[PDB]
Design a protein around this ligand. Structure first.
Ligand SMILES: O=C(NCc1ccccc1)c1cnccn1
Length: 167
């Protein structure tokens, strides 16, 4: 049993809810919250900007130190940093940004990072300002992630479309 509430069960391991991932993290304080990161961990907008704002910029301060030491992530890659006030840990995962010309085939690699964690609160990778088709992102999620993932979908209209169209 875990603390996630009000989710629709899509599969054995994937759950979905129309929710602000910031507000969901604050309520649940999950072991892992996933950030929709870029390779520079520059948390300007989308999910990353919202998560970072909720940390009062502490996520960005930690991230800048991480990049100064390690250099940029790979598209499809991840790193584990603090979850600050939102979670124990933040898994910063870089899905391909279609609005920068990145190979959409890297979305499956991105979601494979989730398999290193038993339970996660996450957004749909490469959705929103990353430009991918969210219906595709949910299909890759279901077909790639084997651990327990709680997808908080920000847009109510998109949520209903994702549920209604789900095979
Ligand atoms: O961009 C965010 N989610 C991604 C998204 C939003 C709309 C349509 C598709 C994808 C976000 C922003 N702020 C808070 C929580 N999520």
């Amino acid at each position: 049993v875990n603390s996630f509430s009000g989710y629709l069960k899509l599969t054995d391991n994937v759950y979905i809810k129309n929710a602000d991932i910031v507000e969901e993290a604050k309520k649940v304080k999950p072991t892992v919250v996933v950030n929709a990161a870029n390779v520079y961990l520059k948390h300007g907008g989308g999910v990353a900007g919202a998560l970072n704002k909720a940390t009062n910029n502490a996520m960005q301060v930690e991230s800048d130190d991480y990049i100064a030491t390690n250099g940029p992530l790979k598209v499809g890659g991840s790193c584990v940093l603090s979850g600050h006030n939102l979670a124990k840990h933040c898994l910063h995962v870089v899905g391909p940004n279609v609005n920068k010309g990145e190979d959409i085939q890297l979305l499956k690699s991105a979601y494979e990072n989730f398999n290193q964690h038993e339970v996660l609160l996450a957004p749909l990778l490469s959705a929103g300002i990353f430009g991918a088709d969210p219906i595709h992102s949910l299909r890759v999620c279901v077909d790639t992630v084997r651990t327990n993932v709680y997808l908080a979908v920000f847009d109510k209209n998109l949520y209903d479309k994702l549920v209604s169209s789900f095979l």
